[PDB]
Amino acid sequence: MQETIALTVSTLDNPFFVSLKDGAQKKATELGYKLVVLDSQNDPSKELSNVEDLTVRGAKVLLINPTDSAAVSNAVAIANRNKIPVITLDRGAAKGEVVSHIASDNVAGGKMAGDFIAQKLGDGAKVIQLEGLAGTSAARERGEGFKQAIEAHKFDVLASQPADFDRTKGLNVTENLLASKGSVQAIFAQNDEMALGALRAISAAGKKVLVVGFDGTEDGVKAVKSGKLAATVAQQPELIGSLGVETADKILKGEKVDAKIPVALKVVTE
Numbered sequence: 001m002q003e004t005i006a007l008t009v010s011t012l013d014n015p016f017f018v019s020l021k022d023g024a025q026k027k028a029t030e031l032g033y034k035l036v037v038l039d040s041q042n043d044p045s046k047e048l049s050n051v052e053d054l055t056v057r058g059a060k061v062l063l064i065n066p067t068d069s070a071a072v073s074n075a076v077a078i079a080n081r082n083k084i085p086v087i088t089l090d091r092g093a094a095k096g097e098v099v100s101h102i103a104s105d106n107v108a109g110g111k112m113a114g115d116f117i118a119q120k121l122g123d124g125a126k127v128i129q130l131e132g133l134a135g136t137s138a139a140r141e142r143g144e145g146f147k148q149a150i151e152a153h154k155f156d157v158l159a160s161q162p163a164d165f166d167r168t169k170g171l172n173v174t175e176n177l178l179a180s181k182g183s184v185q186a187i188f189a190q191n192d193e194m195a196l197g198a199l200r201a202i203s204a205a206g207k208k209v210l211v212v213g214f215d216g217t218e219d220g221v222k223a224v225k226s227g228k229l230a231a232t233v234a235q236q237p238e239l240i241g242s243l244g245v246e247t248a249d250k251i252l253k254g255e256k257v258d259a260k261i262p263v264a265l266k267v268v269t270e
């Protein structure tokens with residue numbers, strides 16, 4: 001009987017997570033596993049029922065990308081109680097027994113983004129941060145890194161506000177902030193979806209604002225190459241997914257794995 005590895009992804013409405021899924025799928029096939037992928041649709045309740053389902057299906061390992069690094073504890077507990085090893089991908093779990101966490105160094109990433117803004121505009125720039133989901137380690141860490149850049153480069157932070165990794169929210173929040181914080185010079189958007197929404201708001205307002213994104217999605221890089229998006233801190237979602245499956249395979253083979261597996265970042269510019 002072919003063995004199954006389960007992947008629960010926070011959403012498939014975001015190109016980044018489609019890439020992560022694809023990387024996990026190709027590596028699963030390469031190593032001889034059936035990959036079962038369930039979409040949490042950014043909903044912790046659906047995530048819980050997803051983990052229940054994959055469990056009754058006899059998944060040998062659970063790869064989970066939490067909708068919320070706190071809320072996910074109860075979902076991890078399901079796998080724990082049913083003796084299914086857990087690997088977290090891209091976002092961590094605050095509680096629950098986890099074998100390995102695989103993600104970018106999102107603190108370094110946030111600092112890279114801020115450093116790039118300073119390189120372009122100089123110290124003392126007026127900036128706005130569009131934050132991701134506050135409950136995720138990815139957003140929290142990017143904020144921490146950006147704070148390091150704010151202090152090092154004496155940025156004037158006009159606003160720092162969530163748009164929940166969503167393109168439409170990114171647009172709406174930016175539209176509002178362009179009205180109230182019109183002197184903003186640069187925006188760090190904690191993912192490319194929000195970056196692209198922000199760019200639409202900026203253009204619609206006829207304003208001049210430098211934007212730095214995060215992920216290096218196809219759309220993100222397209223916007224960078226066109227000169228619309230000043231830069232994006234590129235991640236390797238396919239590699240996060242593939243490393244998840246590779247790590248799952250090692251666990252099942254009885255081989256020890258690293259507790260933390262960092263995945264490299266790179267600033268992509270015009």
Ligand SMILES: O[C@@H]1[C@H](O)[C@H](O)CO[C@H]1O
Nearest residue numbers: 016090091138165191215
């Ligand atoms: O790292 C991922 C990507 O930035 C995605 O775009 C939003 O969720 C984060 O956890």
